[PDB]
Amino acid sequence: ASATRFIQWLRNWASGRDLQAKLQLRYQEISKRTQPPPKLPVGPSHKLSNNYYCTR
Amino acid sequence: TYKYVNLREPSMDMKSVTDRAAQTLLWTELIRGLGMTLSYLFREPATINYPFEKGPLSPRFRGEHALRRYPSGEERCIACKLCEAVCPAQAITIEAEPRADGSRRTTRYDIDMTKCIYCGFCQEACPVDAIVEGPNFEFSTETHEELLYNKEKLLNNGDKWEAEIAANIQADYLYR
Amino acid sequence: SRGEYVVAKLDDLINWARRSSLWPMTFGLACCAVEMMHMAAPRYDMDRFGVVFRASPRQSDVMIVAGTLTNKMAPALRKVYDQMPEPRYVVSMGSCANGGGYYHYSYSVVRGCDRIVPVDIYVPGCPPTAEALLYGILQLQKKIKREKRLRIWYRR
Amino acid sequence: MFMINILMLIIPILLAVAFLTLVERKVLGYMQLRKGPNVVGPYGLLQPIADAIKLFIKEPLRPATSSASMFILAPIMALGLALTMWIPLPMPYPLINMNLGVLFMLAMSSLAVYSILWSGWASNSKYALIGALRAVAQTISYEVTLAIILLSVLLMSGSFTLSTLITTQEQMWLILPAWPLAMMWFISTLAETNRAPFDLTEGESELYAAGPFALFFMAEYANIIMMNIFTAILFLGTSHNPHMPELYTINFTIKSLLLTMSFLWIRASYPRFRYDQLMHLLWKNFLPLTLALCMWHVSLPILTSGIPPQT
Amino acid sequence: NLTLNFGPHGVLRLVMELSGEMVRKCDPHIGLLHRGTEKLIEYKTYLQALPYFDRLDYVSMMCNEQAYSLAVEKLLNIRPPPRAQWIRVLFGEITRLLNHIMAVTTHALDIGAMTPFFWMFEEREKMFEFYERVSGARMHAAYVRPGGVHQDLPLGLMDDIYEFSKNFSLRIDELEEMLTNNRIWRNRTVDIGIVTAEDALNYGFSGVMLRGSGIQWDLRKTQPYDVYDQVEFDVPIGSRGDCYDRYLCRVEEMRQSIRIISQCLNKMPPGEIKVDDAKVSPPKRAEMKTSMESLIHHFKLYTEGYQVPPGATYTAIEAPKGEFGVYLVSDGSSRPYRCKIKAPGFAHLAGLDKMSKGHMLADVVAIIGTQDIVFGEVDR
Amino acid sequence: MWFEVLPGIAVMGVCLFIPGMATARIHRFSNGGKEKRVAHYPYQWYLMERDRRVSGVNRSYVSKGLENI
Amino acid sequence: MELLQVLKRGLQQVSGHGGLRGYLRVLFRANDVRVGTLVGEDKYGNKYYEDNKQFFGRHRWVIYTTEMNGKNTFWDVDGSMVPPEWHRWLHCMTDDPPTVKPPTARKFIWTNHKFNLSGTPQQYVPYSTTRKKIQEWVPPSTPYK
Numbered sequence A: 001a002s003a004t005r006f007i008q009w010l011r012n013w014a015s016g017r018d019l020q021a022k023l024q025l026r027y028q029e030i031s032k033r034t035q036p037p038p039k040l041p042v043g044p045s046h047k048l049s050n051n052y053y054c055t056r
Numbered sequence B: 001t002y003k004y005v006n007l008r009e010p011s012m013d014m015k016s017v018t019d020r021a022a023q024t025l026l027w028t029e030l031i032r033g034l035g036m037t038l039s040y041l042f043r044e045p046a047t048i049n050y051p052f053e054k055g056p057l058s059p060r061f062r063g064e065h066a067l068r069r070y071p072s073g074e075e076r077c078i079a080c081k082l083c084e085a086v087c088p089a090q091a092i093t094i095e096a097e098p099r100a101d102g103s104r105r106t107t108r109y110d111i112d113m114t115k116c117i118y119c120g121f122c123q124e125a126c127p128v129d130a131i132v133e134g135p136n137f138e139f140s141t142e143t144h145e146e147l148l149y150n151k152e153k154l155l156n157n158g159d160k161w162e163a164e165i166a167a168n169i170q171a172d173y174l175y176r
Numbered sequence C: 001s002r003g004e005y006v007v008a009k010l011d012d013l014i015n016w017a018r019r020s021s022l023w024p025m026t027f028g029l030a031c032c033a034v035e036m037m038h039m040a041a042p043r044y045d046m047d048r049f050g051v052v053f054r055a056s057p058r059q060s061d062v063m064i065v066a067g068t069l070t071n072k073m074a075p076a077l078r079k080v081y082d083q084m085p086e087p088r089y090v091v092s093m094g095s096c097a098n099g100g101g102y103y104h105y106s107y108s109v110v111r112g113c114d115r116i117v118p119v120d121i122y123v124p125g126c127p128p129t130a131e132a133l134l135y136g137i138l139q140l141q142k143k144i145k146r147e148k149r150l151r152i153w154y155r156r
Numbered sequence D: 001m002f003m004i005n006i007l008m009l010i011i012p013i014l015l016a017v018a019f020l021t022l023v024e025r026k027v028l029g030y031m032q033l034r035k036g037p038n039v040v041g042p043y044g045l046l047q048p049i050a051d052a053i054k055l056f057i058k059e060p061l062r063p064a065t066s067s068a069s070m071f072i073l074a075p076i077m078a079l080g081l082a083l084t085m086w087i088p089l090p091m092p093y094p095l096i097n098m099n100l101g102v103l104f105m106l107a108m109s110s111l112a113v114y115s116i117l118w119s120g121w122a123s124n125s126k127y128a129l130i131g132a133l134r135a136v137a138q139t140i141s142y143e144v145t146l147a148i149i150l151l152s153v154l155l156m157s158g159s160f161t162l163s164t165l166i167t168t169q170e171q172m173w174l175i176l177p178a179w180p181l182a183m184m185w186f187i188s189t190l191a192e193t194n195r196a197p198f199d200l201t202e203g204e205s206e207l208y209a210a211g212p213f214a215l216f217f218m219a220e221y222a223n224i225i226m227m228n229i230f231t232a233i234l235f236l237g238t239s240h241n242p243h244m245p246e247l248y249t250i251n252f253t254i255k256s257l258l259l260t261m262s263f264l265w266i267r268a269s270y271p272r273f274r275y276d277q278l279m280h281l282l283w284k285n286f287l288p289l290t291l292a293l294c295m296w297h298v299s300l301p302i303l304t305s306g307i308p309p310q311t
Numbered sequence E: 001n002l003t004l005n006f007g008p009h010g011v012l013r014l015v016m017e018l019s020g021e022m023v024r025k026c027d028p029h030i031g032l033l034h035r036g037t038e039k040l041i042e043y044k045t046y047l048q049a050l051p052y053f054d055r056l057d058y059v060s061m062m063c064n065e066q067a068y069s070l071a072v073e074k075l076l077n078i079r080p081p082p083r084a085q086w087i088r089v090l091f092g093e094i095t096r097l098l099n100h101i102m103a104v105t106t107h108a109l110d111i112g113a114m115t116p117f118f119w120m121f122e123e124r125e126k127m128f129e130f131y132e133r134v135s136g137a138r139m140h141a142a143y144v145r146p147g148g149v150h151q152d153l154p155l156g157l158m159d160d161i162y163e164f165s166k167n168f169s170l171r172i173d174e175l176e177e178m179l180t181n182n183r184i185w186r187n188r189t190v191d192i193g194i195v196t197a198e199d200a201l202n203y204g205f206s207g208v209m210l211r212g213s214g215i216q217w218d219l220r221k222t223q224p225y226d227v228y229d230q231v232e233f234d235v236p237i238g239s240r241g242d243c244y245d246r247y248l249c250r251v252e253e254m255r256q257s258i259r260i261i262s263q264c265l266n267k268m269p270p271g272e273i274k275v276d277d278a279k280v281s282p283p284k285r286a287e288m289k290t291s292m293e294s295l296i297h298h299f300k301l302y303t304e305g306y307q308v309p310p311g312a313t314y315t316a317i318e319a320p321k322g323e324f325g326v327y328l329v330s331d332g333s334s335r336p337y338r339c340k341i342k343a344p345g346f347a348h349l350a351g352l353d354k355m356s357k358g359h360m361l362a363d364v365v366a367i368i369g370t371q372d373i374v375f376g377e378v379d380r
Numbered sequence F: 001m002w003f004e005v006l007p008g009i010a011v012m013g014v015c016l017f018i019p020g021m022a023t024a025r026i027h028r029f030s031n032g033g034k035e036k037r038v039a040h041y042p043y044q045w046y047l048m049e050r051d052r053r054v055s056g057v058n059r060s061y062v063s064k065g066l067e068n069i
Numbered sequence G: 001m002e003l004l005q006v007l008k009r010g011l012q013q014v015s016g017h018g019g020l021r022g023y024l025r026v027l028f029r030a031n032d033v034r035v036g037t038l039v040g041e042d043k044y045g046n047k048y049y050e051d052n053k054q055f056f057g058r059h060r061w062v063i064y065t066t067e068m069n070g071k072n073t074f075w076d077v078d079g080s081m082v083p084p085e086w087h088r089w090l091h092c093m094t095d096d097p098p099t100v101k102p103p104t105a106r107k108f109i110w111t112n113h114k115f116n117l118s119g120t121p122q123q124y125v126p127y128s129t130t131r132k133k134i135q136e137w138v139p140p141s142t143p144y145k
């Protein structure tokens, strides 16, 4: 991302692609390394009735 | 559904034949390959400056083992041997007896770090979060013997790394 | 005296050259070789440390044993070790090479490559991360920095 | 005063070879999205020194050779001849001003194949001998086109003197009238110096040590630089101002540096030829064209009335 | 006829008979990485044996886990929940990218084209991060298990996979610029190692070793698993049966893998990620620490393991290297009685002598590469 | 960044610059401040030998002009 | 031209490291003259920097202390010198440094971090932690045969 305008033009021309749109180095688009806590769902067998194991 | 990767007829008109002759004689496709390596020379490299910079890891990372305590300082391990039973490599060896105060505790807790496959099954099996794989991965040694951990080594690892281990557990335990 | 001082500086010079130009022969036996490749890959670029990507066994200073050493393979590994010109160092990488790892109880597996060759550095893990291996190579450099070959030579 | 001049050629040649190892590694690194040496000295500037010292204090493991004299002879011949190739080069003034300088370089370079052959004999192993013979066959094969291409160019220069190439290109680089020959000349130097995609000695043995290994390497990289200095003179002639010879030396050095970097560029860009395929590139492609262009370059000065002077 | 005791993943010993440049005989000597995996598995519970599969084709770790998990699930008569199935397809296709990058760039590196290895191995490093974020390990995740997967995706992972996928086809394009039209690359691969459709079938080939020769076969289409019948993609097919066509098939399969990944990101459903059956899958830690039933089942699942009803299954998947299967025999206990691992590279390498007929020594490197051989799975 | 390759190139370039620069200045030092005489042919050698005798100090690069007429 | 703007940025790294001596010190110790924001410093002397405009992986770094636990680390730096509280931040296992999110204090946690001690007198030596299992009969100390 720090390339000068000339150097960006030079490498875009040499490769033939708009490299700057799809840089292979990651910057701020990556997700935060601290995330809010999850709250995961429970499965279909989490019931208090009509749930006898011999039926599943 | 399928597609053909290499099923095409070259055009046999004069313009197309002369295009391929120019490619043969003027090396155009080879020059185009030179263009791509030239553009990489002027890209910023992906190298990081280790050991001053480090590769990114996550709280789930499976590294060096440690034995943990409760906030009071009591050991969490109660010698249930679930970890020893599950260990795919038979890397764990445990002996236990009643402690002088009647507590169920280990007298031996060994991990052969050269048998261990760093699979994390022990920390899944543990019912009290006593044995964990910590975040440390920089513990190479000069001798084989240094990698045969006894309980004192593993307790020292816990006291050494507990600050980071607790925070990592705090970040992932809701996924467990 | 100056004679001791000259020896101390020469040891520093030869140690600096040898740890600054560590050419590895990598025995890519199994999965641990993949993490060795990621250490040569752009993110870690071991070449930037003076560690060329792949040297020939006769131009090598360090053997990296990167994977399981089976019984069938053990003679070949020892033959390559014996052909290495000195000084030569061995890095054992991964549980398999360290002590047999997951296959420690197998009928066909050598229980640690240190039964076949002397080992300077043991890198733990299954596999060790590329960064962990790089830590081990840097640890080997520090070991070479501590050598005092010339100091011991002149006290003989 | 002349011995000073000899040393001021030999020592910079060896230093330039040392730091070409650094430059090759760093240029290859950045084309591979990495850095290359940057720890041993600032920007890796001490890396060549560490490598040189390491190699020379390394154990010189030489297996009991079938010929002690030929084991020693091969590196001496290789390095001795490599340095000799530099003494007629006009930069802009040659150390030795030879009337037949171009012919001297052709004759000396043809002797460099003996170091390959002798090192094969001394190895005391039929496998290495067979590898040597394959390398010799590649080298002599591409000597055919280099000589004929060189002859074709000299038909526009008029003499075998290397400094006359400077005069011939006062108005225009010879690469313009002779870019077809420059193309095949350039590829021939790659194959001549066993450079990728013609590095089949390294590839085939994949599929020497310490100082003696270092000496063969030094001779190889001296030849690589010299070949590219020759190419610049042959096709990219720099103008010489007799009152400011250092302007010639600056411009001519830049062209040689760039040509040498293009050797590293090419090594980073392509896969390797099979042995039979680089043999067909010579005998079935370059040689037919070189022969036809040799016929053309004999006729052209005669038919255009552009025959150069002898003196 | 000259004989060489070794010529040119692991370590191979090739005994070759030459006549000038031409290879007359090619006799691979394997077992240099035979570690008795199949025997060790007999001493493990089904869970304990799962990590052995990471270390077979140790470039395709999660695909190997999937094959074993499917086999155990079939014998157990249970099924993983839909979200686990989508995660398993998502990481199977990420794993295909990991394998195909290694397969193509080390194939190129072996014949001198060294640079694409570096470009694409920075993409491998980024996918190693996806592995590490779900499992805590970069390679041997042990993440796909019988009954589902070990843990749910951490928050934010799917966004980063999208960011990686959005840019990846350009990386393939740069790889193709170096190789696809390069005359040197074509000289090394075109009309090399031609295999006919009939010979490929009878020699036990699978995967790209079949499709390169025109056979229209892909287990994801014909015998689909977890949710492959719910995603759209094309099977690349060769026409010449040679190394160059197989190279093109692998490159196109990378593009189709991205196409599948794009669909998995969009159609990822909510729910649990392992079978809601605690006699097979361990309960959540919070339940294990509050409910008596959960603690008993946790204790038993991590000591004895679950019993598997007696029976035998041959289960196979379309792994990145071809058909990967296990013939798994249960005796009713919690440890497998027998586990034969069918590794596609075993049959492929057995066909090296056939494919190397009439070729030169340097072509053997190209043919070994086109087969994509990892001796972790060949030798087991 | 790519420009960190330049220091190695600069050292290489200076190393290749010295040979040509040294020869040029050594020739001027040893030939009275002029270019070293080129004698590829007998005629040129003959004139150079004649210059050596005409110089009076046995130096072909010491020139005598109208002052000797 | 931007060439001038690039050269100016090069010169500001010299003043950003406190003149030429400081610029050269980091060049030879760390092979990197980048200037970042000081996140904090640990009790051992390591300093932690960030620059979020760098690409992920190069956006955090540590300049190691020159002395730790009585060892000269001017040239001999090690990855194991990073204490656990900063280890989490440096490896991007978290977004917030210990200066904003301090770790939880415990009586038993090491107050003094130790780096890798292999190869030194402080190295770990394994041994069996269990007591003798069988007691031998001790014959009487007096004679009676």
Ligand SMILES: CCCCCCCCCCCCCCCCCC(=O)OC[C@H](COP(=O)(O)OCCN)OC(=O)CCCCCCCCCCCCCCCCC
Pocket: B024, B025, B026, B027, B030, B031, D180, D181, D182, D183, D184, D186, D187, D197, D231, D235, D266, D270, D281, D285, D286, D289, D296, E183
């Ligand atoms: C008016 C009257 C005028 C009369 C004269 C007119 C003449 C002009 C028209 C003729 C043009 C002649 C071109 C001369 C160059 C040589 C051409 C050539 O040989 O190319 C063919 C060769 C092999 O071709 P291939 O694809 O294998 O198939 C042929 C076999 N069936 O393919 C190759 O050689 C490929 C090269 C392999 C090496 C690759 C590495 C080099 C790539 C980078 C090179 C950069 C360019 C070099 C510039 C050097 C500058 C000093």
Ligand SMILES: CCCCCCCCCCCCO[C@@H]1O[C@H](CO)[C@@H](O[C@H]2O[C@H](CO)[C@@H](O)[C@H](O)[C@H]2O)[C@H](O)[C@H]1O
Pocket: C010, C014, C086, C087, C149, D052, D053, D056, D057, D058, D059, D060
């Ligand atoms: C370029 C100029 C550099 C000038 C530097 C001058 C330094 C002079 C001191 C040389 C020190 C060499 O150090 C020594 O090198 C030889 C290389 O064969 C090594 O090897 C030697 O010792 C080992 C046993 O130790 C032997 O098995 C081996 O056959 C022998 O060659 C030594 O292990 C190493 O201690």
Ligand SMILES: N=C(N)NC(=N)NCCc1ccc(I)c(Cl)c1
Pocket: C052, D017, D018, D019, D020, D021, D022, D024, D025, D048, D049, D051, D052, D055, D214, D217, D218
């Ligand atoms: N091919 C590369 N450029 N790297 C590499 N392996 N270089 C070889 C290193 C070397 C050899 C001889 C000498 I003298 C010096 Cl100073 C350095």
Ligand code: SF4
Pocket: B083, B086, B087, B088, B089, B090, B091, B092, B111, B115, B116, B117, B118, B119, B120, B121, B122, B123, B133
């Ligand atoms: S990580 Fe796996 S192999 Fe290592 S001790 Fe724990 S259960 Fe055993």
Ligand code: SF4
Pocket: B076, B077, B078, B079, B080, B081, B082, B083, B084, B094, B122, B125, B126, B127, B128, B129, B130, B131
């Ligand atoms: S570490 Fe945990 S699982 Fe292992 S014996 Fe102790 S309490 Fe049981």
Ligand code: SF4
Pocket: C030, C031, C032, C033, C066, C067, C068, C093, C094, C095, C096, C097, C101, C102, C125, C126, C127, C128, E055, E058
């Ligand atoms: S130690 Fe682990 S990663 Fe390394 S070869 Fe053995 S099983 Fe594979």
